[PDB]
């Protein structure tokens, strides 16, 4: 069931987000749902304390079912009901914490803004799925939560093999020339 799951999520801490500083630091717990970047194939992350939640008859938590066949966009555009839109949005909140997060200065013209860079969840999940699908092996793989990533993030709880990030090494200069 799906409503059962959305409410299972809500009895708990109940956060649905597209960006978070939880990937940068597991002690951080800042979860941000941006509205503008939600599209047809936008992967969407969610947080529960210790990734809690019941499974269905096929053994999947809410993170699997909300992320295949564009189900989160289907609930987001209300093809399955406007009261479900409400349930989804009740979990879609912006919780903020700046501790254990990077804080840099970016020039905004005759002044600076303290930007706190938090990582995009759609980038992590969709990039891991795509670069494993499209055989792109110029990459690093990192398990984010540590030994037991369920305290981090539902995607870190389920994708235990590690997230794919880009190997951004430049070409070297050969010294003997």
């Amino acid at each position: 069931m799906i409503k059962e799951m959305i409410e299972d999520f809500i009895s708990k801490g109940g956060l649905i987000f597209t960006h978070s500083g939880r990937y940068t630091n597991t002690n951080n717990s800042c979860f941000i749902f941006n509205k503008n970047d939600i599209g047809v194939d936008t992967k969407v992350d969610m947080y529960t304390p210790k990734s809690a939640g019941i499974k269905n008859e096929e053994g999947e938590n809410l993170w699997q079912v909300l992320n295949k066949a564009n189900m989160f966009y289907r609930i987001y555009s209300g093809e399955l009901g406007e009261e479900l839109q409400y349930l989804l949005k009740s979990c879609c909140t912006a919780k903020e914490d700046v501790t254990t997060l990077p804080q840099i200065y970016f020039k905004n013209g005759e002044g600076y803004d303290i930007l706190v860079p938090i990582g995009n969840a759609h980038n992590l999940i969709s990039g891991t799925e795509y670069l494993w699908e499209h055989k792109y092996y110029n990459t690093f793989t990192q398990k984010l939560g540590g030994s037991n990533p369920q305290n981090c993030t539902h995607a870190c709880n389920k994708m235990r093999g590690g997230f794919k990030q880009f190997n951004c090494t430049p070409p070297q200069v050969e010294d003997n020339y």
């Binding site: 002690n27 700046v98 501790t99 254990t100 804080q103 010294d175």
Partner: protein
């Protein structure tokens, strides 16, 4: 009354060492620097894990990165620089109330002993853990502001008094207690012997190909900079039941040995830091410990 600490109070690292490039030289020609190359060998042995008597009989094959001296050079040379940076009390994330009252409780830190133990950890060869043993003769050459010193025999587990390390410690304590920076270019000449295996930094990396993967820099054996930074700050002989110097940690914690010597007995960095801020008369040695933590830096969540 009861000036609380900032939640995310942070300090920058003031002892910044570079990566220790390992070269191969002779005790005769110590100018014949030759990059000790990280080689890759494959190892046949017996698997002997605590719970493996059933599989003890079978073999165990591991590909391991090794680093040995070539058989024409008997001396391991270690290259790094150490930059001591001033402004050790300028917090970059903590506010100007707790950190400034922290600072004004710390001008009475005797920086001379801190600088003496830092330069003595540089000079005695503390940054050379498993290859300072088995060395026939160590020799540390420290070059700073176009002036050069040499140290032959310094015992590493205690800080005995010599005028040369104290003479470097004068300018290091002048930088640390004051402003600016100072840089010591360190040359370690370690007479290990003909073809003796050297010990660079091993890496904390998930590697399916290499069971043991060493640190290389263009293939050349090298040691991690934070490893040498842990070596230089290994000055803490002031914890409870103090026998050997441990690294300056906020909790005095060697997770390598599984023991935290300053945790739970009210002598960690945070209790002494709150005592220094809130006007409690801090001891000289606790003062130097808090100052050494501020020199090391760190973020402090709470």
């Amino acid at each position: 009354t009861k000036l609380k600490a900032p939640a995310v109070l942070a300090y920058s690292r003031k002892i910044n060492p570079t990566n220790a490039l390992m070269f191969a030289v002779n005790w005769s020609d110590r100018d014949n620097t030759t990059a000790v190359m990280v080689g890759t060998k494959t190892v046949a042995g017996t698997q002997s894990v605590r719970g493996n008597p059933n599989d003890a009989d079978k073999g165990n094959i591991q590909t391991v990165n090794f680093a040995n001296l070539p058989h024409n050079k008997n001396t391991l040379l270690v290259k790094y620089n150490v930059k001591f940076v001033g402004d050790v009390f300028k917090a970059e994330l903590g506010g100007g109330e707790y950190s400034n009252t922290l600072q004004t409780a710390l001008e009475n830190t005797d920086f001379g002993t801190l600088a003496y133990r830092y330069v003595y950890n540089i000079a005695a060869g503390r940054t050379l853990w498993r290859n300072r043993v088995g060395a026939e003769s160590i020799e540390t050459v420290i070059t700073v502001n176009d002036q050069t010193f040499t140290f032959s025999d310094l015992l590493v587990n205690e800080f005995d008094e010599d005028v040369d390390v104290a003479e470097i410690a004068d300018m290091v304590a002048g930088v640390l207690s004051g402003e600016g920076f100072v840089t010591l270019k360190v040359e370690h000449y370690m007479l290990l012997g003909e073809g003796s295996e050297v010990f660079p930094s091993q890496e904390f990396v998930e590697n399916s190909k290499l069971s043991k993967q060493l640190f290389d820099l263009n293939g050349q054996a090298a040691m991690h900079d934070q490893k040498i930074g842990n070596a230089i700050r290994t000055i803490d002989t002031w914890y409870e039941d103090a026998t050997t110097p441990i690294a300056v940690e906020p909790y005095g914690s060697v997770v390598r040995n599984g023991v935290a010597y300053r945790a739970g007995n009210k002598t960690d960095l945070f209790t002494l830091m709150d005592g220094a801020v809130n006007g409690k008369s801090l001891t000289e040695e606790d003062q130097m410990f808090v100052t050494a933590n501020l020199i090391r830096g760190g973020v402090f969540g709470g």
